[PDB]
Design a protein around this nucleic acid. Structure first.
Lengths: 247, 302, 177, 302
DNA sequence: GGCTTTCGTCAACCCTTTGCTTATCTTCCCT
């Protein structure tokens, strides 16, 4: 027995489009799983999965180059060079209207759940982008599978993410089978021995290289199983769909 | 003694504006919102570069994205929201020793002047650089917590006293000095005239096809959110030999004009930040400058 | 010559890596050589201060010669000598810096790990070469180091045309329906 | 000792005309305005070409956008709005030293003559480019600040002294030498005759498929703002061997004749602003040329 | 003894120019 809260038409601008070194565009499912665990921390409603779809999404720039951001002189000790233009590190920006659907388990009324999600989203930040606007979130429940599809079709219109898996690698199949690659998680390289320059000193830290899976965009109504669009934190330091690989 | 700064001390952005969608309305019917579309024209002119007298004679053809008002609407409407977020002293990467002693030196920041200059940059039309000039009459409508204000004539280069911007600044300073958030939905009604060219954000993009490429959002002319964020924080009238407000930068640096007003004269963010942490009696105006940098946010490498 | 080049590299800072945060930020300088991902066609990046190093008679630095005909895997499996394996591995070190790099939280089960995502160099170089070779034009192109990318990375120093990354824009929803 | 210009020193444009919509009226019925539609006609003629005389006998089929007056209205009307904005000396991208020393070296410029030549180019109908030939009378109605100003017969190659162009140019020079802005609502009534063919701006197109493609705004024949802006600043009678007024470029360069009237002989704009910044006293029309460049705008650096 | 400023050091490309998908609808039945 499943419960969901849907925030439709989440207009967000200033999204850090740099998903990884080789992916620029839509934020991956690690971003929205991070947003889900962020509310698990601030609001206390513990979130299993998030199904996110893109209503609108434009990467700022041309069709072959992204619009770089005019950097500001914010480091310490480079005064005197501040009159000249700051050097640009690559961070593409994008705008996006999203539709989010969080699997939550809740025991109180739907009004306080909607208010808690609204108070989170008013202080949230989708992929480094300020949430410009969002409709009032609404609670829908998936008692059975037809009710699961009711929740699924309540995200209309949006293009959700379905996992199609890795055959050999990322570049090969992106040309061959023409699917989109995105960060489904990370791979740990080395333990980090210096916790002085970090957010926490006690949380263990690892250098990571983003693993990618290959995904497709399908409209949420054309997705047969809603579990193939709900991304959640898998126990391989990755994220994964509940329904597995989309067929 | 001599509490050093963290190497990678960072603060989040507390004035978060949205993208300024440009619509076309009439001064009469300001409810006839019509997406100003980014068009693409091609331009014949003469190439006149500092070192080009040999090639001055020949032409120069550039494809340029333009954005003009339609010839039945004489008013440019600008849509954005501005979310002022609290917890302006909560560093997310810097440690709890330098940042907390930074914070406890900054409760004596008069947040009222910061909020007044932020809302005055919102209301006077500072976020409308090249299209606030040539406008017959500007009109800013600010909606916050189901209550609406209107401003007709606010001169943008100085902050004169009016009770409406100060009344918004009361709740903005309450959010910034305290907790929570506040959101001002801003409606700019700019009587530019019939078919007057509007000025959205241009993009820093390598584009072979378009010499000038504007910012669009579904084709609709729009301005960058960090552009409006630069506009709202353009409050710094406290640097050395201060004449015009510049943007709150860590070094007071407009790289657009090629001049950094707070670099080298011991009035940047880092020297005043170390003075505030290490117990040196910071001035009120330097206090407000450091607080404005913390409101803007940034990472500080050193 | 090749040994000449490996030692030219070693007199300098001398780092060979497969992953780095140098692509994310040029001020970062964290260089990581993962051992498990080295294969037959694994492109491999290297760092020198300002991309210094002498060229050969055909005008190539060490980055060209170590990256065609699987030469880095040939030195790595020691078909050209075990003392050369040593020279290569003397440059293959893991140098770490977390400043000017993203630090996110990833759930590891009843707890979180602070992951610092650094970009794979083989992904950048081999993806640029392959997607230019296989005519995949659903992409963005980004010059990483800036105006003069030799202070960034040897691959940014040589591949000045920019690296190929995937255009990850989703399909739009048409409003008029 | 030599003050080099900034690398990114650029000036915004100060004369901002709109796209000039053409309507059809009568010399009497100026209230009956019907939009001049851009039609498309397929036209067959001879091959011509300077070379290849073997294919002279073959035909030549080209599809051309045309714009004609209807056979019930004999007058072509051209509407546009010229916005003269002030602050012509504040460089938006170079404000500092050079730019500001150019300002102090250009304070005593005769803005009255520059504004007179601008308002005369609007008033004599030079913004009409090839429409003027065949027009029996060109009547220009400039509405400044709700101020109807009628002009009937002004010769274009010389700026003869009248009182109405000077009357508009008084406050146009007050805007240009100072701050603020002024808007000129300009209508051109030209007795071109019954069914006369009018000449709008033509787009630059590289995909071809149509030999002449006229500029249109929702189908109505219109003129590019750049053409009007070129004709307004056609005031430069101060080049070497000056016979006709040319447009103000940094190099004095017109591209039809394939020449540059001010390049190669030390009176192009960059040399003159380098002299004026470095304390070399320019002559009066020299300062007027440099200030007309700053009113036109452009980028002067590198 | 670091420390912060400014000047000197080291380079060199082969590019390509839209779809990705493509929207949440009536049989029985009796009241």
């Amino acid at each position: 027995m499943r419960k969901f809260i849907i925030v439709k038409n989440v207009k967000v601008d200033g999204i850090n489009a740099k998903s990884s070194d080789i992916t620029v565009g839509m934020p991956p499912a690690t971003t929205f799983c991070g947003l889900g665990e962020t509310m698990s921390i601030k609001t206390g409603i513990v979130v299993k999965a998030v199904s996110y779809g893109s209503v609108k999404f434009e990467v700022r720039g041309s069709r072959f180059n992204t619009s770089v951001t005019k950097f500001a002189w914010q480091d310490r000790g480079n005064g005197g060079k501040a009159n000249n233009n700051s050097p640009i590190q690559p961070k593409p920006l994008a705008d996006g209207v999203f539709t989010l659907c969080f699997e939550v388990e809740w025991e109180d009324c739907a009004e306080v759940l909607v208010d808690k999600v609204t108070n989170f989203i008013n202080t949230a930040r989708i992929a480094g982008g300020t949430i410009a606007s969002f409709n009032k979130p609404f609670v829908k429940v998936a008692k059975d599978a037809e009710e699961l599809a009711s929740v699924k079709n309540a995200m209309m219109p949006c293009y959700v993410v379905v996992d199609c898996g890795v055959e050999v690698n990322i570049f090969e199949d992106a040309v061959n089978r023409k699917l989109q690659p995105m960060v489904n998680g990370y791979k740990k390289l080395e333990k980090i021995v210096d916790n002085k320059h970090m957010r926490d000193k006690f949380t263990p830290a690892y250098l990571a290289t983003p693993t990618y899976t290959m995904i497709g965009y399908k409209m949420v109504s054309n997705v047969d199983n809603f579990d193939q669009a709900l991304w959640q934190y898998g126990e391989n330091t990755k994220v994964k769909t509940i329904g597995g690989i989309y067929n | 003694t001599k509490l050093k700064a963290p190497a990678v001390l960072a603060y989040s952005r507390k004035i978060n504006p949205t993208n300024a969608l440009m619509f076309a309305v009439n001064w009469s019917d300001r409810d006839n919102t019509t997406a100003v579309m980014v068009g693409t024209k091609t331009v014949a002119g003469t190439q006149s570069v500092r070192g080009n007298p040999n090639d001055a004679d020949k032409g120069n053809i550039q494809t340029v994205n333009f954005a003009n008002l339609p010839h039945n609407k004489n008013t440019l409407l600008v849509k954005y929201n501005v979310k002022f977020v609290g917890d302006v002293f909560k560093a997310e990467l810097g440690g709890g020793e330098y940042s907390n002693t930074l914070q406890t030196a900054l409760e004596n920041t008069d947040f009222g002047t910061l909020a007044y200059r932020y809302v005055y940059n919102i209301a006077a039309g500072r976020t409308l650089w090249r299209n606030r000039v040539g406008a017959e009459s500007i009109e800013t409508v600010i909606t916050v917590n189901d209550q609406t204000f209107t401003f007709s004539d606010l001169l943008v280069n100085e902050f004169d006293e009016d009770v409406d911007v100060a009344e918004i600044a009361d709740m903005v300073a309450g959010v910034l000095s305290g907790e929570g958030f506040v959101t001002l939905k801003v409606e700019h009604y700019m009587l530019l005239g019939e078919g007057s060219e509007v000025f959205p954000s241009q993009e820093f993009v390598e584009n072979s096809k378009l010499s000038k490429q504007l910012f669009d959002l579904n084709g609709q002319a729009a301005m960058h959110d960090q552009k409006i964020g630069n506009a709202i924080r353009t409050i710094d009238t406290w640097y050395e030999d201060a004449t015009t407000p510049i943007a709150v930068e860590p070094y007071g640096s407009v790289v657009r004009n090629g001049v950094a007003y707070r670099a080298g004269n011991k009035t940047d963010l880092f020297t005043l930040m170390d003075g505030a942490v290490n117990g040196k009696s910071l001035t009120e105006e330097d206090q407000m400058f450091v607080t404005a940098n913390l409101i803007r946010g940034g990472v500080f490498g050193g | 010559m090749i040994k000449e080049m490996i030692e030219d590299f070693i007199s300098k800072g001398g780092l060979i890596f497969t992953h780095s945060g140098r692509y994310t930020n040029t001020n970062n300088s964290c260089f990581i050589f993962n051992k498990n991902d080295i294969g037959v066609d694994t492109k491999v990046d290297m760092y020198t201060p300002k991309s210094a190093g002498i060229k050969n008679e055909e005008g190539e630095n060490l980055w060209q010669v170590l990256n065609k005909a699987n030469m880095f895997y040939r030195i790595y499996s020691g078909e050209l000598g075990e003392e050369l394996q040593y020279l290569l591995k003397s440059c293959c070190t893991a140098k770490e810096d977390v400043t000017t790099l993203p630090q996110i939280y990833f759930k590891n089960g009843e707890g979180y790990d602070i992951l610092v995502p650094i970009g794979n160099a083989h992904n950048l170089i081999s993806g640029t070469e392959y997607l230019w070779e296989h005519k995949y034009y659903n992409t963005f192109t980004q010059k990483l180091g800036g105006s003069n990318p030799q202070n960034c990375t040897h691959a940014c120093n040589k591949m000045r045309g920019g690296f190929k990354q995937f255009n990850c824009t989703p399909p739009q929803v048409e409003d008029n329906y």
